[PDB]
Amino acid sequence: MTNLQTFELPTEVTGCAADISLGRALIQAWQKDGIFQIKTDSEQDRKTQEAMAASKQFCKEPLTFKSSCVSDLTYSGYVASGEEVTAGKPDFPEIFTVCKDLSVGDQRVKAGWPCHGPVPWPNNTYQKSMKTFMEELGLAGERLLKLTALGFELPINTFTDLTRDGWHHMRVLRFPPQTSTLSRGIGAHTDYGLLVIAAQDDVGGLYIRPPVEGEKRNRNWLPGESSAGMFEHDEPWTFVTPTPGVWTVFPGDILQFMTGGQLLSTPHKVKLNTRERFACAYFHEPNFEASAYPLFEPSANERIHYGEHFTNMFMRCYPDRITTQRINKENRL
Ligand SMILES: NC(=[NH2+])NCCC[C@H](N)C(=O)O
Ligand SMILES: O=C(O)CCC(=O)C(=O)O
Ligand SMILES: [Fe+3]
Secondary structure (H helix, E strand, O other): OOOOOEEOOOOOOOOOHHHHHHHHHHHHHHHHHOOEEEEOOHHHHHHHHHHHHHHHHHHOOOHHHHOOOOOOOOOOEEEOOOOOEEOOEEOOOEEEEEOOEOOOOOHHHHOOOOOOEOOOOOOHHHHHHHHHHHHHHHHHHHHHHHHHHHHOOOOOOOOHHHOOOOOOEEEEEEEOOOOOOOOEEEEEEOOOOOEEEEEEOOOOOEEEOOOOOOOOOOOOOOOOOOOOOOOOOOOOOEEOOOOOOEEEEEEOHHHHHHOOOOOOOOOEEEEOOOOOEEEEEEEEOOOOOOEEOOOOOOOOOOOEEHHHHHHHHHHHHOOOOHHHHHHHHOOOO
């Protein structure tokens, strides 16, 4: 598409008539374009800009310091440019991943649950900026999930019943400038949870793939059907033009599975630009222990254990990271 649809969400979603009309409109936009925008208010906008500023300041730190912000208990922390792999090929942003920030005193960490541990924060100002941002993003994700259930004529809490203490996380990204021979930022892929809410500066680089009539889509939660790299050099790829005062929203793997493909996990990719590009991707996820189920295929026994999918995905992102080594050595998976 050449112009994405932009919506205003209400502060509370109760199931009123306007809620149902909006929820249906959001679903139709996903089914046509693969993505839509939501307007941010003054607080959401500010929190977004504060997160971007903290990201830029952190990236100015020496590489030796950034590399120390790592954990062997959680995937939270720093990812160097070229460390992450998508379809076996290195992605080139530097990243700070924020997963659920759990103390070593948390019962799940004491029990050795995979991926559970405290964030290796660079400092407390950075910590406050990202946690405040993710609180705001979580409120938007809960609204979007209630509206999605209403748009499908499902009980309003269908999806939010799966996101109590949800495994929400965020990737804080800086993409370096391109060269004459290299412009790959992140390869084509689909994300893993229910929703992706994303924000970006004014530089530009994100492309998404809308649903395509007659195009079968891999089911990225299954062994031999990874979505990484698929369609990477074939049209259509919609450029997500930087637009002031909005976040973008598209579905992840769990929504595709639960809706039987009536929604599709939106494939997307990032190209390096002539300038460095800052972006934040937020993932509104089920509880780590939640089992997603088919909504429209009754008598279906299939399930996705979300925590298993997250753990499998991040191990494939970072096969050599100390986090992955400890999972392997201690057979946490
Ligand atoms: N942790 C992520 N969400 N990474 C997004 C990029 C795709 C990821 N490297 C993959 O192979 O699936
Ligand atoms: O750079 C972006 O806008 C999104 C990056 C992304 O897809 C991701 O981190 O999952
Ligand atoms: Fe992504």
